[PDB]
Amino acid sequence: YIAPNPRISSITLTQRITTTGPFAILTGSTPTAQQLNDVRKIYLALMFPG
Amino acid sequence: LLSVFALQEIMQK
Amino acid sequence: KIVVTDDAKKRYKIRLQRFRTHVPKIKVLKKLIDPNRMTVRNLENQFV
């Protein structure tokens, strides 16, 4: 699993440092094992339509 | 590896 | 000249060092500093 360029969020979500929205608080979180397993479930569901 | 937004969450304990 | 090179690994290393310097892991427990200071917030995307 590859990740996007880190500079995308720095210039867009953290464009203003004196404000805090729903996106900015969770742009700094990290996933656990079960959450990665759920991501794998989502991708498996996508790759078999219907 | 840390972000300033997680600092508030861990700090508010 | 104080030069900072575009190589990502170096910028990450200075970023980590500055984050340690401003907010160290040791007195973040004892002194219970507030994370709302303008400098510590500015540290988030200062050298990205």
Side-chain angles (χ1 to χ4, degrees):
Chain A
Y1 292 100
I2 63 170
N5 201 329
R7 265 167 182 197
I8 305 291
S9 68
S10 66
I11 62 170
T12 317
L13 276 71
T14 301
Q15 192 256 329
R16 315 198 40 101
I17 193 66
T18 77
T19 196
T20 311
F23 276 88
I25 62 170
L26 56 87
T27 198
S29 51
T30 185
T32 71
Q34 308 210 21
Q35 287 144 357
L36 294 174
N37 207 5
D38 291 331
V39 168
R40 199 187 325 280
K41 288 184 181 179
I42 297 169
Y43 264 108
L44 187 53
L46 272 163
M47 282 158 57
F48 281 90
Chain B
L1 290 88
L2 206 55
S3 68
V4 309
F5 299 110
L7 207 54
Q8 290 98 56
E9 176 261 310
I10 193 66
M11 185 64 72
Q12 63 84 30
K13 304 290 192 282
Chain C
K1 300 289 94 175
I2 303 298
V3 287
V4 163
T5 301
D6 181 40
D7 186 74
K9 277 73 69 177
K10 325 280 173 39
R11 323 191 71 141
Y12 175 78
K13 286 178 268 272
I14 295 89
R15 216 151 82 84
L16 191 147
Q17 183 62 255
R18 288 189 68 234
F19 190 82
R20 194 162 91 130
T21 300
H22 285 241
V23 60
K25 199 171 178 181
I26 183 71
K27 64 90 175 179
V28 72
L29 319 179
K30 262 75 72 178
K31 273 187 166 178
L32 298 163
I33 60 183
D34 45 350
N36 313 330
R37 174 71 290 161
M38 184 75 48
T39 69
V40 66
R41 314 271 311 201
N42 191 315
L43 294 174
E44 174 65 32
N45 64 347
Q46 204 167 9
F47 267 108
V48 173

PDB file of all heavy atoms in Angstrom, chain B residues 1-5 8 11, chain C residues 12 28 33 35 40-41 44:
ATOM      1  N   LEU B   1       8.364  10.362  15.205  1.00  0.00           N
ATOM      2  CA  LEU B   1       7.184  10.599  14.381  1.00  0.00           C
ATOM      3  C   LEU B   1       6.030  11.076  15.246  1.00  0.00           C
ATOM      4  O   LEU B   1       5.511  10.316  16.062  1.00  0.00           O
ATOM      5  CB  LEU B   1       6.774   9.329  13.630  1.00  0.00           C
ATOM      6  CG  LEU B   1       7.650   8.818  12.488  1.00  0.00           C
ATOM      7  CD1 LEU B   1       8.736   7.897  13.020  1.00  0.00           C
ATOM      8  CD2 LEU B   1       6.803   8.107  11.448  1.00  0.00           C
ATOM      9  N   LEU B   2       5.624  12.331  15.072  1.00  0.00           N
ATOM     10  CA  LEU B   2       4.491  12.850  15.823  1.00  0.00           C
ATOM     11  C   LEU B   2       3.909  14.042  15.082  1.00  0.00           C
ATOM     12  O   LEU B   2       4.576  14.677  14.263  1.00  0.00           O
ATOM     13  CB  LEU B   2       4.891  13.239  17.251  1.00  0.00           C
ATOM     14  CG  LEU B   2       3.783  13.218  18.306  1.00  0.00           C
ATOM     15  CD1 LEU B   2       3.102  11.864  18.342  1.00  0.00           C
ATOM     16  CD2 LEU B   2       4.342  13.569  19.673  1.00  0.00           C
ATOM     17  N   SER B   3       2.647  14.330  15.384  1.00  0.00           N
ATOM     18  CA  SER B   3       1.945  15.482  14.846  1.00  0.00           C
ATOM     19  C   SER B   3       1.396  16.313  15.995  1.00  0.00           C
ATOM     20  O   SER B   3       1.078  15.788  17.066  1.00  0.00           O
ATOM     21  CB  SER B   3       0.805  15.060  13.919  1.00  0.00           C
ATOM     22  OG  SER B   3      -0.224  14.419  14.649  1.00  0.00           O
ATOM     23  N   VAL B   4       1.292  17.622  15.763  1.00  0.00           N
ATOM     24  CA  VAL B   4       0.850  18.525  16.814  1.00  0.00           C
ATOM     25  C   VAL B   4      -0.619  18.332  17.157  1.00  0.00           C
ATOM     26  O   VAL B   4      -1.051  18.724  18.246  1.00  0.00           O
ATOM     27  CB  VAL B   4       1.132  19.982  16.410  1.00  0.00           C
ATOM     28  CG1 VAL B   4       2.575  20.127  15.976  1.00  0.00           C
ATOM     29  CG2 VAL B   4       0.193  20.421  15.300  1.00  0.00           C
ATOM     30  N   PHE B   5      -1.406  17.737  16.259  1.00  0.00           N
ATOM     31  CA  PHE B   5      -2.821  17.531  16.547  1.00  0.00           C
ATOM     32  C   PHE B   5      -3.025  16.388  17.531  1.00  0.00           C
ATOM     33  O   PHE B   5      -3.917  16.449  18.385  1.00  0.00           O
ATOM     34  CB  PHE B   5      -3.584  17.277  15.249  1.00  0.00           C
ATOM     35  CG  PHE B   5      -3.513  18.418  14.280  1.00  0.00           C
ATOM     36  CD1 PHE B   5      -2.787  18.303  13.107  1.00  0.00           C
ATOM     37  CD2 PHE B   5      -4.165  19.608  14.546  1.00  0.00           C
ATOM     38  CE1 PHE B   5      -2.719  19.355  12.213  1.00  0.00           C
ATOM     39  CE2 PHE B   5      -4.101  20.663  13.657  1.00  0.00           C
ATOM     40  CZ  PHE B   5      -3.376  20.536  12.489  1.00  0.00           C
ATOM     41  N   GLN B   8      -2.586  17.463  21.394  1.00  0.00           N
ATOM     42  CA  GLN B   8      -3.731  17.908  22.181  1.00  0.00           C
ATOM     43  C   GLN B   8      -4.508  16.725  22.738  1.00  0.00           C
ATOM     44  O   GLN B   8      -4.930  16.740  23.901  1.00  0.00           O
ATOM     45  CB  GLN B   8      -4.648  18.789  21.332  1.00  0.00           C
ATOM     46  CG  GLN B   8      -4.074  20.150  20.988  1.00  0.00           C
ATOM     47  CD  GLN B   8      -3.446  20.187  19.611  1.00  0.00           C
ATOM     48  OE1 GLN B   8      -4.092  19.867  18.614  1.00  0.00           O
ATOM     49  NE2 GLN B   8      -2.180  20.580  19.549  1.00  0.00           N
ATOM     50  N   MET B  11      -2.558  15.034  25.403  1.00  0.00           N
ATOM     51  CA  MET B  11      -2.298  15.983  26.475  1.00  0.00           C
ATOM     52  C   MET B  11      -3.501  16.214  27.379  1.00  0.00           C
ATOM     53  O   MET B  11      -3.320  16.495  28.568  1.00  0.00           O
ATOM     54  CB  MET B  11      -1.840  17.314  25.873  1.00  0.00           C
ATOM     55  CG  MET B  11      -1.416  18.362  26.882  1.00  0.00           C
ATOM     56  SD  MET B  11       0.028  17.846  27.823  1.00  0.00           S
ATOM     57  CE  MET B  11       1.296  17.997  26.571  1.00  0.00           C
TER      58      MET B  11
ATOM     59  N   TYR C  12      13.610  15.648   6.848  1.00  0.00           N
ATOM     60  CA  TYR C  12      12.951  14.871   7.890  1.00  0.00           C
ATOM     61  C   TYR C  12      13.792  14.819   9.159  1.00  0.00           C
ATOM     62  O   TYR C  12      13.256  14.901  10.270  1.00  0.00           O
ATOM     63  CB  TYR C  12      12.656  13.459   7.392  1.00  0.00           C
ATOM     64  CG  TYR C  12      12.088  12.567   8.464  1.00  0.00           C
ATOM     65  CD1 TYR C  12      10.757  12.664   8.838  1.00  0.00           C
ATOM     66  CD2 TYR C  12      12.884  11.633   9.110  1.00  0.00           C
ATOM     67  CE1 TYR C  12      10.232  11.857   9.821  1.00  0.00           C
ATOM     68  CE2 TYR C  12      12.368  10.821  10.095  1.00  0.00           C
ATOM     69  CZ  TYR C  12      11.043  10.937  10.446  1.00  0.00           C
ATOM     70  OH  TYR C  12      10.526  10.127  11.429  1.00  0.00           O
ATOM     71  N   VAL C  28       7.475  16.958  28.750  1.00  0.00           N
ATOM     72  CA  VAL C  28       6.086  16.931  28.307  1.00  0.00           C
ATOM     73  C   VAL C  28       5.231  16.188  29.321  1.00  0.00           C
ATOM     74  O   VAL C  28       4.021  16.421  29.421  1.00  0.00           O
ATOM     75  CB  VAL C  28       5.981  16.303  26.900  1.00  0.00           C
ATOM     76  CG1 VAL C  28       6.233  14.807  26.946  1.00  0.00           C
ATOM     77  CG2 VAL C  28       4.634  16.609  26.270  1.00  0.00           C
ATOM     78  N   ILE C  33       3.029  20.977  29.449  1.00  0.00           N
ATOM     79  CA  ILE C  33       2.976  22.196  28.656  1.00  0.00           C
ATOM     80  C   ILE C  33       1.732  22.210  27.776  1.00  0.00           C
ATOM     81  O   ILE C  33       1.215  21.163  27.365  1.00  0.00           O
ATOM     82  CB  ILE C  33       4.257  22.331  27.818  1.00  0.00           C
ATOM     83  CG1 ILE C  33       4.403  21.132  26.881  1.00  0.00           C
ATOM     84  CG2 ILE C  33       5.456  22.453  28.728  1.00  0.00           C
ATOM     85  CD1 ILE C  33       5.668  21.149  26.065  1.00  0.00           C
ATOM     86  N   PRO C  35      -0.218  22.658  24.355  1.00  0.00           N
ATOM     87  CA  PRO C  35       0.124  22.537  22.936  1.00  0.00           C
ATOM     88  C   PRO C  35      -0.446  23.636  22.055  1.00  0.00           C
ATOM     89  O   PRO C  35      -0.397  23.502  20.830  1.00  0.00           O
ATOM     90  CB  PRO C  35      -0.490  21.183  22.556  1.00  0.00           C
ATOM     91  CG  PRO C  35      -1.618  21.014  23.503  1.00  0.00           C
ATOM     92  CD  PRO C  35      -1.184  21.636  24.787  1.00  0.00           C
ATOM     93  N   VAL C  40       4.705  25.843  18.561  1.00  0.00           N
ATOM     94  CA  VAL C  40       4.590  24.393  18.452  1.00  0.00           C
ATOM     95  C   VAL C  40       3.599  24.015  17.358  1.00  0.00           C
ATOM     96  O   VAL C  40       3.791  23.018  16.653  1.00  0.00           O
ATOM     97  CB  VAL C  40       4.233  23.763  19.815  1.00  0.00           C
ATOM     98  CG1 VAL C  40       2.855  24.178  20.289  1.00  0.00           C
ATOM     99  CG2 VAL C  40       4.346  22.245  19.751  1.00  0.00           C
ATOM    100  N   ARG C  41       2.537  24.805  17.181  1.00  0.00           N
ATOM    101  CA  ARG C  41       1.630  24.560  16.066  1.00  0.00           C
ATOM    102  C   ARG C  41       2.313  24.823  14.732  1.00  0.00           C
ATOM    103  O   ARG C  41       2.123  24.071  13.771  1.00  0.00           O
ATOM    104  CB  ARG C  41       0.373  25.418  16.203  1.00  0.00           C
ATOM    105  CG  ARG C  41      -0.239  25.410  17.585  1.00  0.00           C
ATOM    106  CD  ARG C  41      -1.240  24.281  17.736  1.00  0.00           C
ATOM    107  NE  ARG C  41      -2.193  24.247  16.634  1.00  0.00           N
ATOM    108  CZ  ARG C  41      -3.376  23.650  16.689  1.00  0.00           C
ATOM    109  NH1 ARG C  41      -3.782  23.019  17.779  1.00  0.00           N
ATOM    110  NH2 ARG C  41      -4.170  23.687  15.624  1.00  0.00           N
ATOM    111  N   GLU C  44       4.358  22.085  12.830  1.00  0.00           N
ATOM    112  CA  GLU C  44       3.745  20.944  12.153  1.00  0.00           C
ATOM    113  C   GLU C  44       4.146  20.865  10.685  1.00  0.00           C
ATOM    114  O   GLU C  44       4.490  19.787  10.188  1.00  0.00           O
ATOM    115  CB  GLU C  44       2.223  21.016  12.283  1.00  0.00           C
ATOM    116  CG  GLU C  44       1.481  19.949  11.493  1.00  0.00           C
ATOM    117  CD  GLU C  44       1.761  18.545  11.992  1.00  0.00           C
ATOM    118  OE1 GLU C  44       1.992  18.378  13.208  1.00  0.00           O
ATOM    119  OE2 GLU C  44       1.751  17.606  11.169  1.00  0.00           O
TER     120      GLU C  44
END
